[PDB]
Design a protein around this ligand. Structure first.
Ligand SMILES: *[C@@](C)(CO)[C@](*)(O)[C@H](CC(C)C)NC(=O)[C@H](Cc1ccccc1)NC(=O)[C@H](CC(C)C)NC(=O)[C@H](CCc1ccccc1)NC(=O)CN1CCOCC1
Ligand SMILES: *[C@@](C)(CO)[C@](*)(O)[C@H](CC(C)C)NC(=O)[C@H](Cc1ccccc1)NC(=O)[C@H](CC(C)C)NC(=O)[C@H](CCc1ccccc1)NC(=O)CN1CCOCC1
Ligand SMILES: *[C@@](C)(CO)[C@](*)(O)[C@H](CC(C)C)NC(=O)[C@H](Cc1ccccc1)NC(=O)[C@H](CC(C)C)NC(=O)[C@H](CCc1ccccc1)NC(=O)CN1CCOCC1
Ligand SMILES: [Cl-]
Ligand SMILES: [Mg+2]
Ligand SMILES: [Mg+2]
Lengths: 196, 230, 222, 212, 195, 222, 125, 204, 195
């Protein structure tokens, strides 16, 4: 996997590749690693496919039950539920999750949750095996309060490089835009991003 | 006792009516890191043989040097070095097969899988495989690594037995090879889009094609796929 | 850690008659769950009316056959073109195999031909060089399937004369080349059905005083 | 394997089975486990087939070279010691052998030497070697006397192998008998356990554990 | 523990069991009785892991004695052997299994027949004319195959048994300090004092 | 095993080979790998044979009870959810690898489930030892907007690739077509391209050949 | 190593080095062997130009090779020690492998073989 | 220490014209030591026959367990259990011990009393059903039995002819296996008669 | 191999060595002589790994016999023991060491004194009044500490030795089939036939 989430002026954008592997065989080349836990709270999944799916399903259940009683949960609340599962079951889990959501009060927020189950609130986050190759690039190129088009280009260029160098990453680049306007899905194919 | 460091993936090949085709991508992987992109893994020997090599690249470069030196040694005191006493594909193979088995027998192998493709002096198609264990075999289609699992099934639909070889043209054969290379790019995590292809024909001779790319790819259906279940 | 051995599958079968001997073997070559070749012969005419097959790890099999073929060549050079008898070949092969007692050829070896009285002969070897002359031997992946069938049909084991209260055994007799080839073909079609490493094609080598003939038959390719 | 050889009034009896196994797979029922070294010397084979076969055949070559060089048949003691010194050189390398060198000479008389692959060499009157040695010992010891006749001794040897062939899963096939006298060794036939078991059961009245 | 034998003849069952108890390089005792009377016409010998053997034997003894008092009736050797087998069959899949092998010799008063059962620690039961546990069988079975007849007397059985002990004393590596022999027949259980 | 699933115009089709192995030995030459979870939800299973049968029957049972409870035709996502949560709970120890397909009031669906409890969505999928041979064919010939007859052809061709090229797969091709608005049609032995040839000889023994010691009538009645 | 062929043929077919070694034997003190019906006796000469000798410690002319075989000689004294030593070692080696002491013929054959080897080996006389 | 090959043994079953046959060897050993030559591996519950190879203690335990279960079945159902139904019961029972299994290789054989159809089935140790038209094999010489049955078998054999075929399959397979043999039993099963024959075989 | 003992008394050295040769679960021989005469007044008993024992003993025997012929003189027990020790001391750092333990009993004719040396496979030499190798020492040493006196006769030494064998036969686990006893004194080496 290569995954990332980036806050910007109007909200936050999540990004991911589409490759799932068993050793060197690609079990699925069109995977969707960006998943909904609430209307405007989404997550990027890295690590074990089974573990991250099981976790995301449980979180979705918790936030649905939260909404029924207390109304819309904050992005921080969602990250806390992810943490609780990842931390308490750290011995039996291989899951690197990035949580991203849009409030109207708090605007765009990004929380990253590594293997240990620690929580880290950041302006932007990167994760997955392919992220190692773009720490240098992303640090040099990230700016706060970017526009939508700038952030899409930042994510597209970043994941393009991650995909290029990481064998465990590839396929299409999926993205999910979270703003006050709503939820927008984007896709970008190899023929475009490879020759960037 | 070794472990392979910088590696090359599948080499694929098949016979057709007048000759043989062989192909391999231009990638040099360093584990999961796709380190080197300008690596040529098809090495011609004379104008009648191409040796395709997968596995460890340091050992591939050693084998290159051996073949290069073999050409030099054959030319010594040999007036017919470019005629009757030129290096045949069968000679080049048997030499490599000997080396591979001797190295495995000394518990210090050349960590490779090799396919020698070419045309003999009498016009007969030559295509044979050898690997780090010294295991050798021949078939109308041959492939290494992931190619063995994914390419061979596709190539065997064209040439399933011996009698299917005369019925297979160079146009049909190359189409199948190029298709197989696309499939490997979809499914092999240590493959690249860029590759080389070589044709050895009994009439038109050796044609070496560099800087080819996988194209006409189907990715559009990906946009419709959402989630993992619900 | 590097493993110098591998398994190339396949199976072989030798039967001896009165004035002939057959050595059969399938043409399939495999590694793990993949097919390498549907036609890769492993039964070879070695000269002096001796046919040989070394089934198991193909690299060791080819090496051994290659060395024995070469042994026959040097036998002619050193002993005035004398014909190498099947019993002499067998003893020579034991020394080839035992020479690598502490890093063995991983193969089951079978040779066939005629003895010095003109009668059919089959010898079989373990990987390190033990050998024994027999009327009948199956070797390789499907040996455990075929061998008991041969005990029953070639050597008439567990078969008694009807009505004799299980007191008189079915008498031993030589089989015709026609009857033997029937048994070989049936043995391999049965082995192909129940063993995954066996199939594609069957190649039989028949050995009479007139020379070495070949016969080929198709086998199921799944 | 099950092999035995014992010394008695009328010379030496040697008896062996004919089975060969690879794990639980019965590979052969017709293996010759006695090697004829010369008209006066026998060698028995137990353990690794090839190890025994190869080196006892080699032993015969060394014995032939002795009588060419010395103009005299080799002693049983000297023959056994050639084999034991050889395997001792390979000690630790993984050879697997349990052999018995049996024969008659003028100076020694009837003699039996046990030789194995960890270098042990023992002179003795009775030995049983192999996976079914204990079964053979049980019958042999309980019926052995020095004053046995040639006829009775041949039968006891045969009967002891049959006992082991029955109980030991890795012994069977057929019994090969040998009698060694002052004049040399004499072969007393191949006896298939298939027919021999029932013949012995009926005539002797033994093997009541088996369904008749 | 080590050597336990059993022979069923015409009218009785004879059990022989070694007297030695060894631990390390010391024979701690040379007069150990490796048997328990389960009922007046049923005897069980045992061999195996230290501690487990006696604990198991006495546990079975208690259960059979309980049954006898409750029903005022003696269980058949067949019934006792099945009970014992099931207990071992349970044991083998426990947290810590009983590592005990037993022979059960009994006289069925309803059938007027002697019966010998051999049960290993896994719970593998077989009825036999003669039986043994451990390395003993590797010598005695072949010997009995030859010399045993089904119509033998108790005296003939004891001579047959002497032949087994002599062979073991000749070819076994360890000194097992002789055997205690006991006979089970229509009149119950008794011990042979001079063997 | 080789198993596949393919989506088309008005529904979904799944297929499978019919070989069951026990190491290198073919245990069953014509076993049924297509399982019915509900009338219009079918399952193709690879991996541990007992686990695939047991897990499919359990969820199939609970789906039936659920369907009766809710008075609704069962959905594929319900079977998918129940299967994955069961398999996840056992951390991969239940070796079931499934392709789940079917039609329901929501529409037509195609999923795969792995032993550790991960699920995938797709228009074409393949699982089992011959999945690479099958996926090669699917990747070469699959397109959007397949017809019923085109999808059956593509599915069976993908299974055939496994049958011929994978040693783990063989024998026949089973198919199940699940179209919207119609009953699901289970096509047992849709293709039989591996028929055993006539044997060379009849092995019918003369009556009395086998030696017998005892005869006795057995009482089955009360 | 010193390789020179010292023992070689001459035009008349003689090996002079071997023949000159016989002259050394001819110079040596006389030795005689006589065998009776139930015994053998070895007699040896000792030259009397050497007085003030110590006969206790002076090397004896007859040497035991084993408890049942003896060896006397004529020629170079220093050379004889090398043959005697080899013979003694071979005597013990024979007992070890054959489990029987050497015959007199065998021991002789061995010593003679050693002497022969020194007639067609390079670097030795 | 491989539970399935400590004691040894084999079972084979075949179908014929309006009949079925099931056969087994008699050996029970402890690795190399042969212990008993009277250990039958075939049992029956009404008209349904069950053969079990593998670890002997589990063979005994399972027989006792299925006798237990079929007796309660008959009391409640008021009829004998049929082969197809019994097959499902065996499968259920074995899979119940999925992560602590009985080390066995059972084989069901019998004729359905209603339809008259011959039926055989085989299982692995954890309960996977293996149904077959022709034959089922099990035990330490299963490879040998597979080879014998595949070559010797033909469809629609008469009861007398079927006996010869199954007996030769068992005997010759047992003789190539060290841990199998020491006697043999064959059951011929017609619609309403069952013949049991003991075979003469080599005792080594 | 297993039991080898040695006792030095006033005028002689007495060596006792077990007769059993066991391999697996079978006593192959019960009359084995675990000793070699190195010289007329020097005897060496041995015990350890199969094959190694006899090979080593005979190799030492050959070397000492060679020395005797060369010098026409018998080496002292002390000199022989030192030669033996050095050979074992070389062996322990070889590719494959001799796993053999020995006792050397001799009578020094120059000193007119008996001498007993105990040497293990590492090449550890000690001169002792009484010695043993293996598990035997764990019983015999304490027994000899009590009953041994330095001025004992050969007859007193044999009775003392009978006491050791009796104790071993009572408390040792394995049957070693009795011992062969040999005496070394001024008149050379002789064997006691009735023990
Ligand atoms: C990139 C690839 C790396 O970070 C991404 O993180 C993606 C995340 C997406 C899919 C959410 N990760 C994967 O694709 C993931 C890589 C991986 C593999 C193993 C452990 C952790 C991560 N792949 C998987 O989870 C696959 C998905 C299957 C093929 C549908 N699963 C496996 O590879 C399973 C997992 C077993 C497992 C191990 C440890 C923890 C949890 C589960 N492994 C196998 O099936 C084993 N296989 C047997 C045959 O030999 C090859 C290995
Ligand atoms: C009784 C019968 C059993 O112990 C006897 O002891 C006989 C002695 C007779 C044959 C002289 N012993 C055997 O039969 C002996 C048992 C044995 C096996 C292996 C090691 C030690 C002892 N069997 C053999 O030696 C067989 C004989 C063959 C079947 C003709 N040979 C093998 O098992 C060979 C070689 C074994 C080996 C030894 C040392 C180094 C390497 C290998 N192995 C194979 O053939 C391998 N195997 C055959 C089945 O297919 C898979 C590969
Ligand atoms: C292709 C053919 C291979 O991938 C398919 O995937 C099929 C799936 C179909 C049949 C549902 N797979 C098999 O046929 C499968 C291959 C296999 C084997 C072992 C582990 C995983 C997969 N075969 C089986 O499951 C067989 C079914 C038989 C023919 C009835 N079962 C076995 O081979 C069992 C395995 C049982 C098992 C227990 C615990 C963990 C994993 C597996 N093995 C045995 O019966 C062997 N043995 C015989 C002696 O008695 C003890 C058990
Ligand atoms: Cl996923
Ligand atoms: Mg296939
Ligand atoms: Mg046997």
């Amino acid at each position: 996997t290569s995954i990332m989430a980036v806050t910007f002026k109007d909200g936050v954008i999540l990004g991911a590749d589409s490759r799932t592997t068993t050793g060197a065989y690609i079990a699925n080349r069109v995977t969707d690693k960006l998943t909904r836990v609430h209307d405007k709270i989404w997550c990027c999944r890295s690590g074990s496919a089974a573990d991250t799916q099981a976790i995301a399903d449980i979180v979705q259940y918790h936030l649905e039950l939260y909404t029924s009683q207390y109304g819309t949960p904050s992005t921080e609340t969602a990250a806390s539920v992810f943490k609780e599962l990842c931390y308490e079951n750290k011995d039996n889990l291989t899951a690197g999750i990035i949580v991203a959501g849009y409030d109207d009060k708090n605007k765009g927020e990004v929380y990253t949750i590594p293997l240990g189950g620690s929580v880290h609130k950041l302006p932007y986050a990167i994760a997955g095996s392919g992220s190692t190759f773009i720490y240098g690039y992303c640090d040099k190129n990230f700016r706060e309060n970017m526009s939508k088009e700038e952030t899409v280009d930042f994510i597209k260029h970043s994941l393009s490089q991650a995909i290029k160098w990481d064998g465990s990453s590839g396929g299409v680049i999926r993205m999910v835009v979270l703003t006050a306007a709503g939820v927008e899905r984007l896709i970008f194919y190899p023929d475009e991003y490879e020759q960037l | 006792t070794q472990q392979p460091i910088v590696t090359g993936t599948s080499v694929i090949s098949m016979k057709y009516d007048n000759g043989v085709i062989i192909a391999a991508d231009n990638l040099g992987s360093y584990g999961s890191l796709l380190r080197f992109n300008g690596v040529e893994r098809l090495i011609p020997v004379g104008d009648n043989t191409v040796v395709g090599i997968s596995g460890d690249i340091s050992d591939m470069q050693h084998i290159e040097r051996l073949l290069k030196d073999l050409v030099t040694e054959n030319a010594y005191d040999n007036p017919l070095a470019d005629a009757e006493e030129a290096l045949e594909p069968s000679y080049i193979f048997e030499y490599l097969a000997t080396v591979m088995y001797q190295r495995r027998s000394k518990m210090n192998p050349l960590w490779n899988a090799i396919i020698v493709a070419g045309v003999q002096s009498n016009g007969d198609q030559f295509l044979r495989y050898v690997n780090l264990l010294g295991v050798t075999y021949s078939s109308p289609t041959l492939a290494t690594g992931f190619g063995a699992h994914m390419a061979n099934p596709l190539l065997r639909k064209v040439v399933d037995r011996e009698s299917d070889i005369p019925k297979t043209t160079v146009q049909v054969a190359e189409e199948a090879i190029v298709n197989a290379m696309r499939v490997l790019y979809y499914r092999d995590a240590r493959s690249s889009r860029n590759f080389s292809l070589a044709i050895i024909d009994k009439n038109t001779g050796l044609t070496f094609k560099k800087n080819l790319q996988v194209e006409n790819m189907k990715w559009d259906f990906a946009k419709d796929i959402k989630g993992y279940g619900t | 850690q590097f493993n110098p051995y591998g398994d190339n599958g396949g199976t072989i079968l030798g039967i001896a008659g009165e004035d002939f001997a057959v050595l059969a073997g399938d043409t399939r070559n495999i590694t793990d769950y993949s097919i390498n070749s549907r036609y890769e012969p492993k039964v070879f005419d070695c000269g002096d009316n001796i046919v040989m097959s070394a089934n198991g790890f193909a690299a060791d099999g080819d090496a051994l056959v290659k060395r024995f073929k070469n042994s026959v060549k040097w036998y002619h050079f050193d002993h005035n073109d004398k014909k190498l008898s099947i019993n002499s070949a067998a003893r020579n092969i034991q020394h080839l195999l035992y020479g690598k007692r502490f890093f063995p050829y991983y193969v089951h070896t079978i040779i066939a031909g005629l003895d010095e009285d003109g009668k059919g002969a089959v010898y079989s070897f373990d990987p390190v060089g033990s050998y024994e002359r027999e009327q009948c031997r199956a070797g390789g992946a499907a040996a455990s399937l075929i061998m008991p069938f041969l005990d029953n049909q070639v050597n008439f084991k567990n078969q008694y004369e009807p009505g004799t209260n299980g007191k008189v055994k079915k008498p031993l007799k030589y089989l015709s080349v026609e009857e033997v080839i029937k048994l070989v073909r049936d043995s391999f079609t049965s082995a192909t059905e129940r063993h995954i490493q066996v199939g594609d094609g069957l190649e039989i080598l028949i050995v009479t005083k007139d020379g070495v003939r070949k016969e080929f038959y198709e086998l199921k390719r799944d | 394997t099950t092999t035995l050889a014992f010394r008695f009034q009328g010379g030496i009896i040697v008896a062996v089975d004919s089975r060969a196994t690879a794990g639980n797979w019965v590979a052969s029922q017709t293996v010759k486990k006695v090697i004829e070294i010369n008209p006066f010397l026998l060698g028995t084979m137990a353990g690794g087939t090839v190890d025994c076969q190869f080196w006892e055949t080699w032993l015969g070559s060394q014995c032939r070279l002795h009588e060419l060089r010395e103009k005299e048949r080799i002693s049983v003691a000297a023959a056994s010691k050639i084999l034991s010194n050889l395997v001792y050189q390979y000690k630790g390398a993984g050879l697997s052998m349990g052999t018995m060198i049996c024969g008659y000479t003028r100076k020694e008389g009837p003699t039996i030497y046990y030789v194995d692959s960890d270098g042990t060499r023992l002179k003795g009157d009775i030995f049983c070697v192999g996976s079914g040695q204990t079964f053979a010992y049980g019958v042999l010891d309980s019926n052995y006397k020095w004053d046995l006749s040639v006829e009775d001794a041949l039968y006891l040897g045969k009967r002891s192998i049959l006992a082991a062939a029955h109980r030991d899963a890795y012994s069977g096939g057929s019994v090969n008998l040998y009698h060694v006298t002052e004049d040399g060794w004499i072969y007393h036939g191949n006896h298939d356990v298939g027919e021999l078991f029932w013949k012995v059961k009926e005539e002797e009245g033994s093997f009541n554990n088996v369904i008749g | 523990m080590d050597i336990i034998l059993g022979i069923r003849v015409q009218d009785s069952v004879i059990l022989a069991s070694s007297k030695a108890v060894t631990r390390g390089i010391s024979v701690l005792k040379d007069s150990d009785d490796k048997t328990r009377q389960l009922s007046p016409h049923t005897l069980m010998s045992f061999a195996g892991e230290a501690g487990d053997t006696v604990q198991f034997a006495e546990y079975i003894q208690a259960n059979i004695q309980l049954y006898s008092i409750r029903e005022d009736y003696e269980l058949s050797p067949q019934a006792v052997s099945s009970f014992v087998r099931q207990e071992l069959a349970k044991s083998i899949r426990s947290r810590r299994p009983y590592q005990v092998n037993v022979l059960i010799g009994g006289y069925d008063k309803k059938k007027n027949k002697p019966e010998l059962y051999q049960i290993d620690y896994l719970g593998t039961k077989v009825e036999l004319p003669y039986g043994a546990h451990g390395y003993s069988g590797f010598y005695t079975f072949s010997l009995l195959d030859h010399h045993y007849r089904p119509d033998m007397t108790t005296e003939e059985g004891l001579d047959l048994l002497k032949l087994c002990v002599q062979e073991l004393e000749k070819r076994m590596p360890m000194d097992f300090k002789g055997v205690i022999v006991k006979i089970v027949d229509k009149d119950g259980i008794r011990q042979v004092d001079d063997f | 095993t080789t198993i596949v699933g393919v989506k088309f115009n008005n529904g979904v089709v799944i297929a499978a080979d019919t070989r069951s192995t026990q190491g290198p030995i073919v245990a069953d030459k014509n076993c049924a790998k297509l399982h019915r979870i509900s009338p219009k939800i079918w399952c193709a299973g690879a991996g541990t044979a007992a686990d695939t049968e047991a897990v499919t029957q359990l969820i199939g049972s609970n789906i039936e009870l659920h369907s009766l409870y809710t008075s609704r035709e069962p959905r594929v996502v319900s079977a998918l959810q129940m299967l994955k949560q069961h398999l996840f709970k056992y951390q991969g120890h239940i070796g079931a690898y499934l392709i789940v397909a079917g039609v329901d009031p929501t529409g037509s669906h195609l999923f795969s489930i792995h032993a550790h409890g991960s699920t995938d969505v797709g228009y074409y999928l393949s699982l089992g030892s011959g999945s690479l041979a099958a996926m090669a064919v699917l990747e070469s010939h699959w397109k959007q907007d397949l017809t019923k007859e085109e999808a059956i052809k593509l599915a069976s061709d993908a299974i055939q690739a496994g049958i011929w090229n994978d040693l783990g797969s063989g024998s026949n091709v089973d198919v199940c077509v699940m179209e919207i608005g119609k009953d699901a049609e289970y096509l047992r032995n849709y293709l039989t391209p591996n028929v055993r040839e006539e044997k060379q000889k009849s092995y019918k023994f003369p009556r009395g050949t086998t030696a017998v010691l005892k005869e006795s009538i057995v009482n089955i009645c009360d | 190593g010193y390789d020179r062929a010292l023992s070689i043929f001459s035009p008349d077919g003689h090996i002079f080095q071997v023949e000159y070694a016989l002259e050394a034997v001819k110079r040596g003190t006389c030795a005689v062997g006589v065998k009776g019906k139930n015994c053998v006796v070895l007699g040896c000469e000792r030259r009397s130009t050497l007085k003030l000798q110590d006969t206790r410690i002076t090397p004896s002319k007859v040497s035991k090779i084993d408890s049942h075989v003896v060896l006397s000689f004529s020629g170079l004294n220093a050379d004889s020690r090398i043959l005697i030593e080899k013979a003694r070692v071979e005597a013990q080696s024979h007992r070890l492998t054959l489990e029987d002491p050497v015959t007199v013929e065998y021991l002789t054959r061995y010593v003679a073989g050693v002497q022969q080897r020194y007639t067609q080996s390079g670097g030795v006389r | 220490s491989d539970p399935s090959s400590i004691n040894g043994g084999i079972v084979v079953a075949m179908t014929g014209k309006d009949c079925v046959a099931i056969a087994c060897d008699l050996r029970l050993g402890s690795q190399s030591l042969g212990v008993s030559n009277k250990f039958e591996k075939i049992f029956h519950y009404g008209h349904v026959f069950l053969g079990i190879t593998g670890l002997a203690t589990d063979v005994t335990t399972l027989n006792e367990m299925f006798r237990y279960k079929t007796n309660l079945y008959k009391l409640k159902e008021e009829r004998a259990i049929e082969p197809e139904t019994f097959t499902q019961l065996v499968s259920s029972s074995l899979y119940e011990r999925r992560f602590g299994p009985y080390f066995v290789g059972p084989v069901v054989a019998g004729i359905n009393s209603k339809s008259g159809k011959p039926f055989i089935a085989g299982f692995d140790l954890i309960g996977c059903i293996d149904e077959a038209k022709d034959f089922i094999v099990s035990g330490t010489a299963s490879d040998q039995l597979f080879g014998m049955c595949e070559s010797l078998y033909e469809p629609n054999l008469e009861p007398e002819d079927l006996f010869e075929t199954i007996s030769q399959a068992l005997l010759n397979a047992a003789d190539r296996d060290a841990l199998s043999g020491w006697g043999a039993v064959v059951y011929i099963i017609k619609k309403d008669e069952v013949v049991k024959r003991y075979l003469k075989m080599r005792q080594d």
